[PDB]
């Protein structure tokens, strides 16, 4: 995905990490469904396809064993969603959320 | 278990008022006073200032909680 | 590429059967990346499928089938599939199908050993497309050669008829009695 | 912006509860009611109990 | 652990930390002085 | 298909004795404490 | 060998009911 | 068959967009044209599915149509027609950049867009679409600015503003979506009126709520109920119970959270 974000084109990914995505769900494998969840985020929030990412996020159960970088990725983007759709205080949670869940030396 | 005791007295209560108001026992005029004292000394707990002490005294508690 | 699948589900009702096909076709195409959008506007295309008059019902109860699969229902998806009726394919070796097949055989099993549990009068009654499909499945094991998952499927689903001919019609009939006798003996609880 | 915009955003925080004063058109000002004592109410209650859970 | 590579980085008081010494204001010296002469 | 379809539920239920295998162990330190 | 795992499916509900609940009500007599 | 059916579709629409362009009052004639070149835009591959590369006449029918029937439903006073077009605009316009070279009329029709999403009050909607136009788009161009200005008068309560909208109106087509917008942001400011004002009279309240006649006045106030001014003056100033289940409630929860350990 980092590859392609390089090209510039992210919806070519979409459709190949989308269905690995559905085949990583099927397979339950918390950290590969973590991660495509977080990376297909990320491409909507690139391409601003806000009510897209809307629909995914409330359709889509996020792993709960996930690591803490997956989940500050996770909460970031779910955060930047609930702020243009006018959910405030879940903003303000997941938000803060994904600032303690980031590592404190990098990032 | 306190509150399944009161029941417990109340329903005794109300039996005893049931079979006098039907006629089976007589006018008990002791008994009837004790029982319209006790349901003077029910108190109000909507007096506007019983709520500011309670709510008052509600948070004096939780703060040490 | 395609951003949204607002267009299409719009398309969906038209009032123009043509035009509620082409957007059915598009939805199918399209649903393994919008099936949230699809997801969102279940409802019109689940009362398109109960329209028996429009002519694509087989179609559309694939199309709102796939969608709740990628929902993860499977429970709705799976009965949407089985109302597509032949047209799902079977050999197409998707995912999405195996995964199909899979749910499909679990309720069989799950509502046929709660049938032989109850008595002898009424059970409830069993869908006989469900059963076709699970049948094809044991003609595509007996098929390929895997007589051991027969006998498994078959003891699962208390198919008497079936694991009796997938054991005769094996290439060891000594082998396969030991198996299900050795299994028989050490797994099957009720009496 | 002119005056008339500010009593309708002052009329609408008042009635969005940001404010609980009542607006004198007649003389034309904002009268603020007494802030009723926080502490004698279930304010308190809800903090410590969010703090506490 | 994870570096974050995937956003970009832009190159770059014990006591409580209060949001009221922030005011853009004149010294209270100016301010005085302003008001005294205009008085 | 079938394989698959073994396979699939084979591995949800390794899954599901793993986790609880570490349940187990947990509440097995508790009590032997 | 797949119907075998089905006898791991009959071991997964031996960890999980038989002794789960086993060390639950072990420990409650053992506070007692 | 291609080709025909191409070129079957490109004369239907000359001869609609010449109707439209230059006859003002084009009516039914014109949504029964729709239907028909609709059935007939079924094929050209309609909205492509991508991968197609058509780089067809697809541009010219499929937006230009829709387009129009996006105005059709506005002067039919159609919402769901114009949601369908709009969608499908949506889907055209900002799905496929590149390979088209984008319509002076996107930014005026995705304004009328939104300013429909505000007077359906779908403010969620609205600012999501919102956030698809470009930065520079939402600050600069005046169809984009003034159903985002429009909604910031809303939301700060800058009802005079928004009632002057009426007077602005960039493109007259938007006076659908406004007056619609004006009725029920009458109702807000009187449910201001109601919560505010302890006392309000008449003469100055018809300016408040933006009425012109006394008998819209004393018709509104029916509507719902008030007291006529008897002194000339709309008197709506009609303004304990410890909530002891719910705490003992919470008080429960705090020991079954402290005894479970």
């Known amino acids: 995905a980092r590859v392609y974000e390089f090209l510039d084109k992210l919806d070519v990914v979409r459709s190949f990490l989308h269905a690995r995505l559905r085949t990583a769900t099927l397979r339950h494998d918390a950290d590969g469904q973590a991660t495509l969840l977080n990376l297909l985020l990320r491409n909507y929030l690139h391409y601003s396809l806000y009510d897209q990412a809307e629909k995914l996020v409330s359709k889509s159960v996020f792993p709960e064993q996930a690591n803490n970088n997956e989940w500050a990725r996770y909460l970031y983007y779910t955060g930047r969603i609930k702020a243009i759709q006018l959910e405030y205080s879940e903003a303000r949670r997941t938000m803060t959320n994904a600032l303690r869940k980031a590592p404190q030396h990098t990032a | 278990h306190g509150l399944k005791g009161l029941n417990s007295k109340l329903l005794d209560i109300r039996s005893y008022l049931e079979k006098v108001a039907t006629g089976k026992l007589p006018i008990n005029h002791q008994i009837i006073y004790q029982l319209q004292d006790v349901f003077n000394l029910l108190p109000d707990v909507s007096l506007q200032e019983f709520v500011k002490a309670f709510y008052l005294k509600t948070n004096d508690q939780m703060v040490v909680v | 590429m395609i951003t949204s699948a607002a267009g299409i589900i719009s398309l969906l009702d038209e009032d123009e059967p043509q035009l509620k096909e082409f957007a059915l076709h598009k939805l199918n195409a399209v649903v393994n990346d919008f099936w949230a959008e699809i997801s969102e506007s279940v409802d019109k295309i689940e009362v398109l499928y109960e329209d028996e008059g429009f002519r694509s019902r087989q179609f559309a109860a694939l199309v709102a089938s796939k969608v709740f699969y990628h929902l993860g229902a499977f429970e709705e998806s799976l009965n949407y599939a089985l109302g597509a009726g032949d047209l799902f394919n079977v050999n197409d070796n998707s995912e999405y199908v195996e995964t199909i097949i899979a749910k499909c055989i679990d309720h069989y099993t799950k509502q046929c050993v709660e049938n032989a549990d109850l008595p002898e009068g009424e059970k409830k009654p069993i869908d006989q497309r469900l059963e076709g499909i699970v049948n094809k499945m044991f003609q595509r094991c007996l098929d390929d050669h895997k007589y051991k998952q027969a006998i498994g499927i078959a003891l699962e689903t208390r198919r008497l008829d079936v694991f009796e001919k997938t054991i005769l019609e094996s290439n060891d009939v000594p082998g396969m009695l030991a198996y299900s006798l050795k299994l028989c003996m050490s797994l099957m609880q009720n009496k | 912006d002119s005056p008339e915009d500010a009593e309708f955003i002052v009329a609408k925080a008042i009635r969005d509860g940001v404010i609980e004063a009542s607006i004198n058109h007649e003389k034309g000002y904002v009268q603020s009611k007494e802030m009723i004592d926080i502490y004698s109410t279930r304010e308190p209650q809800l903090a410590f109990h969010q703090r506490i859970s | 652990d994870d570096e974050f590579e995937e956003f970009p980085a832009e190159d770059w008081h014990v006591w409580e930390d209060n949001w009221d010494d922030d005011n853009v204001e004149d010294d209270f010296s100016n301010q005085l002085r302003a008001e005294l002469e205009k008085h | ?33 | 060998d797949l119907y075998s795992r089905y006898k791991k499916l009959q071991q997964e509900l031996e960890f999980l009911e038989v002794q789960e609940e086993y060390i639950k009500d072990e420990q409650k007599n053992l506070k007692k | 068959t291609s080709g025909a059916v191409l070129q079957a579709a490109t004369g239907m629409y000359e001869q609609l967009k010449g109707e439209w362009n230059r006859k003002s009052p084009n009516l039914s004639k014109c949504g029964e044209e729709l239907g028909r070149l609709k059935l007939v835009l079924l094929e050209l591959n309609f909205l492509p599915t991508t991968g197609t590369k058509l780089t067809k006449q697809q541009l010219i029918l499929a937006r230009d149509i829709l387009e129009i029937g996006a105005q059709w439903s506005i002067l039919r006073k159609d919402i769901p027609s114009f949601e369908r077009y709009m969608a499908q605009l949506k889907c055209y316009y900002f799905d496929y950049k590149e390979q088209l070279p984008e319509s002076a009329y996107m930014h005026q029709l995705l304004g009328l867009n939104l300013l429909f999403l505000l007077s359906q009050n779908r403010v969620a909607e609205f600012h999501t679409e919102l956030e698809r136009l470009p930065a520079k788009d939402i600050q600069t161009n005046v169809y984009i600015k003034h159903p985002v200005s429009l909604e910031q008068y809303l939301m700060e309560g800058s009802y005079n503003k928004v009632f002057l909208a009426k007077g602005n109106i960039p493109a007259e087509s938007y006076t659908f979506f406004i007056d619609i917008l004006l009725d029920t942001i009458r109702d807000e400011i009187a449910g201001c009126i109601e919560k505010a004002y302890e006392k309000i009279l008449f003469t100055e309240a018809t300016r408040i709520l933006f009425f012109n006649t006394p008998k819209k006045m004393t018709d509104y106030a029916k509507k719902r109920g008030w007291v006529l001014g008897p002194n000339n003056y709309y008197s709506f100033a009609s303004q304990t119970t410890i909530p002891s289940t719910e705490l003992a409630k919470q008080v429960i929860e705090y020991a079954r959270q402290l005894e479970m350990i």
Do not use: M, P
Not at chain 6, 5 to 11: A, G, R, T
Not at chain 6, 15 to 22: A, M
């Open chain 6, 1 to 33: 298909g079938l394989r698959q379809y073994y396979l699939s539920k084979i591995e949800e239920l390794q899954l599901i004795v793993n986790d609880k295998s570490q349940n187990l162990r947990r509440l097995q330190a508790q009590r032997n404490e």
